[PDB]
Amino acid sequence: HRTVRKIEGNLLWYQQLQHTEAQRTAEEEQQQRRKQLCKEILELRAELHHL
Amino acid sequence: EEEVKALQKQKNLHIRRRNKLQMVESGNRQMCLKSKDKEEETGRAFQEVL
Q: Do B11 and A37 touch (CB under 8 A)?
A: no
Contact A41, B7 (CB under 8 A): yes
User: Which amino acid, residue B36?
Assistant: K
B8: chain A residues, CB-CB within 8 Å:
44
The C-alpha atoms of residue A30 and residue A14 are separated, in whole angstroms, by: 24
3-state DSSP assignment of residue B50:
coil
Q: DSSP secondary structure string, A2-50?
A: HHHHHHHHHHHHHHHHHHHHHHHHHHHHHHHHHHHHHHHHHHHHHHHHH
Listed in sequence order, the residues at least 6 apart from B8 whose beta carbon sits closer than 8 Å to its beta carbon are A44
User: H or E element: which one contains B2?
Assistant: helix B2-49
Quick one: DSSP state of residue B1?
-
Quick one: which of B25, B12, B3 has its CA closest to A48? B12
User: Which amino acid, residue B17?
Assistant: R
3-state DSSP assignment of residue A51:
coil
3-state DSSP assignment of residue B43:
helix
> In Å, how far from its chain's centre is CA B29?
6
Nearest-Å Rg of the Cα atoms of chain B is 21
* Inter-chain CB pairs, A–B, below 8 Å: 21
Give A9 to chain B, closest Cα distance, Å: 38
A45: chain B residues, CB-CB within 8 Å:
7
